[PDB]
Design a protein around this nucleic acid. Structure first.
Lengths: 175, 138, 199, 109, 145
RNA sequence: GAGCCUCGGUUGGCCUCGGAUAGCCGGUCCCCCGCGGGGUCCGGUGCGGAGUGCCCUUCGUCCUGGGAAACGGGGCGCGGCCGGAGAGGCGGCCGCCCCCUCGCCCGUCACGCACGCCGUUCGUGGGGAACCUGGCGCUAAACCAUUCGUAGACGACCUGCU
RNA sequence: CUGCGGGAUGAACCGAACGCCGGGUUAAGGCGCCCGAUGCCGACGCUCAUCAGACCCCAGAAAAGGUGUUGGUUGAUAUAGA
RNA sequence: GGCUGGGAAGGCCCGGCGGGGAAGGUGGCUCGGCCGAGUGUUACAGCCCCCCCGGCAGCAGCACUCGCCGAAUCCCGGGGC
């Protein structure tokens, strides 16, 4: 499984009706995937892992993207992860600060890849929950909980280095 | 020694990006290198923006860190940020650079003639000043 | 029509790649103060690397072996030659176009020299990392003329300080003359600043 | 009375790592270093000027020793302001890293 | 390209000169006039591909361009075949092209209307008398005209 | 003045040291030091307008006939005083003769206007080789041959000979 | 019995199979220089090595350890004062 | 053209309800000129934020380019080889 700018999808599906079971129950899942095809594939994977249901033996009643209810609001998202390392699998709980649930999930994927070299196919996401200022255990996200936030940009390393390459003036890093 | 700090309510100039060359006020800090920003009086929508693309100026209007797109606009209008920004030397040289970029061929010829005459006059005056200073030293 | 570059404050490979690419395109490049070049990593690591380079030698006849030049200018020339295809005529011509000097000679001591921000230490290296001066490396690896170059550079710095004082006095006189004469050139500065000048 | 053409450097032929196509030259035009400012130079005529021993003909003047190879700029080359040029006669490879004149009169302004 | 605009001629012997566009002929060539007193460019024909259209326009609506001059008027007629053709003769001589005083009177008639309008705009006569060229640090894609 | 070969090119920038969790410029009332330098204080900028995102020069000519500006430049102008040693190779400061009215705005015409067709335009009196004008200065040394042994397979090497 | 692009080099690897060419687009691979192209104002984090690291076959390393550093799991006690 | 017959946002706001960051307040202390600035404690809303009741054209994948799928639910013009 690859990853990009992930989006959240609500997928409801059920096994195809049978003469013994005329009205099978429906199951709903939240899958974070780049597109609906991979979202449905991951939904079928998780459904096969959990219940006795297969893609050929079932059907997805409805797959639809879920939009963030408060895009302009900054939120703390706690994500429960179950990934596979070189050794045995482990369970983790991480906290991120972002405006969207899909963005938080993407940031979690990038952080997992950067810190543990864990691939998206080995990463399984269980639950993502929005939490208030309290109930936060990670100091990296706790330090930003401050009303009178104040910090400068000390070492402003300049960009546009290949804009005119030879110049008389040396650049400046204090602003 | 720092004089500009990333504080809630500080105006910043967008160096590059979609809304390049616009003022925008920081509403809340999202992450280490991402801030929530709002541009109601400068045709910029409330959105996340990295600190790299924004250069913070020395204007700080006061409003709560989670204002709902209206109190920030009211504070901006009360402080009259646009007029003070236009009066600052930063926007003046920005406009000068834009005018030089938009200069045409006839304007270039007129500028060349004016520069020629002005430089000749200034050089003559500088030479007279130098000879007067040399005479004073002697 | 010839690039003049100040080697001080530039990273070795970062500047060498740019110089080689420019000199491949027919551009004549002159680099001065090659002792001011600094390489990333700790000085002991860089010294061990250069000592390994020294140890690389032809066993049967070292006279034919690698020529380990100790001068910083020749070190920079060799690292540019390593990025240039010196086996071909175009590479040889690029090497001939390139010029490197220890310190900065009188032919180029009175010329303004450019600075490449894409190869500067402050730009490309984190402030918490260590770096080694090419002059220090050369002196501890076999260079002989560090002190003489330093004394000549100090004399040149004094002369350039005198020249800059004179130029600054000239600029102050020009500002005073402009302030005194703006009344009869008001119509010229006005049309100058309408198009985006002096603002 | 002055220069009515832009300066360009003959960077080399259109080539891969181990294969080169001599029918498509690469031109580095001074002043443009991105694939946004190169739209002006698309379709522009270009000339490689070189002087030789024997005198040749010359329009609007006495015979001279100078000769040129004409060509046309086709498209840009890879985000750095480099452009592709096609000449009637392939460049002799002696002009590698040499100056050529990008004329300004396939005008589309 | 609009009537009354200022163009830069890049291909002819009037290389880099600035002229005034009057009208487009039947053949599609642009009728160009750079005042004989100022630019020394008479009623001539130019091509769009070999012309740079500057962003400088004069009000040319109130002039009467002569109707008789046209693409057929701007044509060459020499180099006839039937003569001797052998030796050092047969059209290598005559050394010259006549000025065709009708051309002079047409130029006077056009300039009598062109000059007062271009002299109304300050420094426009000097701009026309100047010629266009590229210098160091100036790029056509960078500067706008 | 022609006269063969070889070519690159298509205005120049004649300059501080320097730091990046900091710098640039003045006056320096004040103090110290050899017009200049350093320190304190104060005043202006710092996404750099005392910006290489820059500056300098214009890239048609000539006639006269006005205004603003104005004693500037040239005759590889002729003679003195210096800076410069890193691989100096360039510039500055003073005397005397003659000539010109050039930069910026307006009238005033005329410049083969070669009738649309490309290598135009310059650093160039470019670099190398062979020949036609004058002034001021020159007078050979090397090798072979001979000799010697401090040298030597042969060369080579140390030496002597109006 | 097989050329061609990439793996610097190359039987068997990846892509892809061959008449002579012009234009366009790709695969596998790459875009500091050699060497065509990131000369993006690329995004998020980790890493200091006095043996760093740098891409299938493949040209090299194990068990055991480290408060060097960055995350996770669990367990106690702390204003009745650790 | 479709969506959660799109999500939030922009403007006038009106009659209520609870919760929280911790403010023209109070207040131990600290720093400067009753005021300004920085920290803490209960904490209504005269700084605000969130939820429940209920309604107005102002919309429209919006040139306030905050994040999609697209085409008988699709057409025109122009440039380069």
């Amino acid at each position: 499984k690859a990853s990009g700018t992930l989006r959240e999808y609500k997928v409801v599906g059920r096994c195809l009706p049978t003469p013994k079971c005329r009205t099978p129950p429906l199951y709903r899942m939240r899958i974070f995937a780049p597109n609906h095809v991979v979202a449905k594939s991951r939904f079928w994977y998780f459904v096969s892992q959990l219940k006795k249901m297969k893609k050929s033996s079932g059907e997805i009643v409805y797959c639809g993207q879920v939009f963030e209810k408060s895009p302009l609001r900054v939120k703390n998202f706690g994500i429960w992860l179950r990934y596979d390392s070189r050794s045995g699998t482990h369970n983790m709980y991480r906290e991120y600060r972002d405006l969207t649930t899909a963005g938080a999930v993407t940031q979690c994927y990038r952080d997992m890849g950067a810190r543990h070299r864990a691939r998206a196919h080995s990463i399984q996401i269980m639950k993502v929950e929005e939490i208030a200022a309290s109930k936060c255990r990670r100091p990296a996200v706790k330090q930003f909980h401050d009303s009178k936030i104040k910090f400068p940009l000390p070492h402003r390393v300049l960009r546009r280095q290949h804009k005119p390459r030879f110049t008389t003036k040396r650049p400046n890093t204090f602003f | 020694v720092f004089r500009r700090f990333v504080e809630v309510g500080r105006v910043a100039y967008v160096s590059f990006g979609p809304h390049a060359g616009k003022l925008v006020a920081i509403v809340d800090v999202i992450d280490q290198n991402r801030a929530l920003v709002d541009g109601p009086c400068t045709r910029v929508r409330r959105q996340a923006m990295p600190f790299k693309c924004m250069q913070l100026t020395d204007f700080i209007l006061k409003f709560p860190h989670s204002a709902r797109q209206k109190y920030v606009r009211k504070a901006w209008e009360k402080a009259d940020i646009n007029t003070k920004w236009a009066a600052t030397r930063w926007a003046k040289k920005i406009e000068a650079r834009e005018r030089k970029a938009k200069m045409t061929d006839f304007d270039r010829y007129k500028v060349m003639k004016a520069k020629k005459m002005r430089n000749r006059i200034i050089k003559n005056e500088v030479k007279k000043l130098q000879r007067a200073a040399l005479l004073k030293a002697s | 029509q010839v690039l003049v570059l100040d080697g001080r404050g530039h990273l070795l490979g970062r500047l060498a790649a740019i110089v080689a690419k420019q000199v491949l395109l027919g551009r004549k490049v002159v680099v001065v103060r090659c002792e001011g070049i600094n390489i990333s990593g700790n000085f002991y690591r860089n010294k061990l690397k250069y000592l390994a380079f020294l140890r690389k030698r032809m066993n049967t006849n070292p006279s034919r072996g690698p020529y380990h030049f100790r001068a910083p200018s020749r070190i920079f020339w060799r690292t540019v030659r390593g990025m240039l295809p010196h086996k071909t005529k175009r590479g040889q011509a690029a090497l001939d176009r390139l010029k490197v000097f220890d310190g900065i000679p009188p032919p180029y001591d009175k010329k303004k020299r450019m600075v490449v921000p894409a190869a500067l230490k402050v730009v490309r290296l984190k402030p918490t990392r260590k770096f080694a001066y090419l002059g220090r490396l050369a002196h501890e690896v076999g260079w002989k003329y560090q002190a003489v170059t330093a004394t000549l550079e100090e004399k040149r710095k004094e002369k350039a300080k005198i020249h800059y004082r004179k130029k600054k006095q000239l600029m102050r006189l020009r500002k005073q003359a402009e302030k005194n004469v703006e009344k009869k050139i008001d119509r010229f500065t006005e049309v100058l600043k309408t198009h985006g000048f002096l603002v | 009375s002055g220069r009515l053409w832009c300066k360009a450097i003959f960077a080399g032929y259109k080539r891969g790592l181990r294969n080169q196509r001599e029918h498509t030259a690469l031109l580095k035009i001074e002043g443009v270093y991105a694939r946004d400012e190169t739209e002006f130079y698309l379709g522009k005529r270009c000339a490689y000027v070189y002087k030789a021993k024997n005198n040749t003909v010359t329009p609007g003047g006495k015979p001279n020793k100078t000769r040129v190879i004409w060509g046309k700029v086709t498209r840009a080359h890879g985000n750095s302001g480099m452009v592709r040029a096609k000449f009637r006669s392939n460049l002799p490879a002696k002009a590698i890293g040499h100056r050529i004149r990008v004329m300004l009169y396939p005008s589309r302004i | 390209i609009t009537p009354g605009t200022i163009l830069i001629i890049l291909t002819g012997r009037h290389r880099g000169k600035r002229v005034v566009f009057l009208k487009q002929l039947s053949s599609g060539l642009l009728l160009v006039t750079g005042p004989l007193s100022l630019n020394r460019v008479p009623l001539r024909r130019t091509h769009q591909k070999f012309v740079i259209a500057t962003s400088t326009k004069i009000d040319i609506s109130g002039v009467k361009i002569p109707k008789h001059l046209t693409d057929a008027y701007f044509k060459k007629k020499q180099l006839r075949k039937p003569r001797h053709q052998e030796g050092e003769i047969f059209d290598t001589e005559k050394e010259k092209y006549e000025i065709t005083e009708q051309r002079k009177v047409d130029q006077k008639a056009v300039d009598s209307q062109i000059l007062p309008k271009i002299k109304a705009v300050p420094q426009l006569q000097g701009y026309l008398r100047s010629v266009f060229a590229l210098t160091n640090g100036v790029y056509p894609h960078k500067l706008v005209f």
